[model samples]
Target: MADKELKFLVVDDFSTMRRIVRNLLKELGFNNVEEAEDGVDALNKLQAGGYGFVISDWDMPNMDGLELLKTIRADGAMSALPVLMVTARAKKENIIAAAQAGASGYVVKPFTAATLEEKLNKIFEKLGM
Candidate 1:
């Protein structure tokens, strides 16, 4: 990783779920993490700038994760932001949908802190950050 200063945004409806991912990221030495309740809140927080990674859940009350990915992919400056869909929906249809939307990076729900470590570092390496 470039510097350990990469900021992360973890989005989910459940605060409990968000907390776990938040803690996991901290263990990965990514302490610069924040949480948003859902996709709409995610956009709001993202607009504040400084976020470099997004790990989000699929189902949400408003503007689910997939919809969020499309909007990010739709933006210019936000174009190449790496997103990992740590969703419970592990179907090929859902995964392909995420991949096509450009947030293809995937991790199913109930993942461990180590899984995120591998995936996060992998994304950082791939993006050459």
Candidate 2:
């Protein structure tokens, strides 16, 4: 069973994309979700605490997802926070970079709800949740 109580932070520069992710998560039975317009906002929310998962876009103003992942990994308080990259960036190198930065999962843009669900489940399993 999925943990509906686990809070989710969905980060994206575009409001449309944010809404799409938010709606998709809702459909997947995760109603405890919040939105962040960019990496900076996401970081701030994350620092404030209480987030269990993060789904972020690669491109954004002020700070991008990669930078956010690196920052989260560097911060002692949030180093183990589960971050999942949901971005348009589909390059092999991008995948490598996200992994090296400690992202828990990666999903290329133009993805399906099934893909998102699978990734979320995989991350949860890997985290021993």
Alpha-carbon TM-score of each model against the true structure: 0.95, 0.94
**What clash count does candidate 2 reach?**
0
Residue-level lDDT tens digits of model 1 in 1-129 = 766778889999999999999988888788899999988999999989988889989999879999999998898878798899987758999988998999838898798988888888788778787
> How well is each residue in 26-99 modelled by candidate 2, as lDDT tens digits?
88889999999888899889988988889999888899989989998998988898999987768899999999
Q: What range of 10 consecutive residues in model 1 has the weakest lDDT sum?
A: 120-129
Rate residue 93 of model 1 by lDDT.
Answer: 93
Worst 10 residues of 2 by lDDT: 1-10
User: What ranges in model 2 sit over 4 Å off?
Assistant: none
Question: Candidate 2, overall lDDT?
Answer: 0.88
lDDT of each: 0.87, 0.88
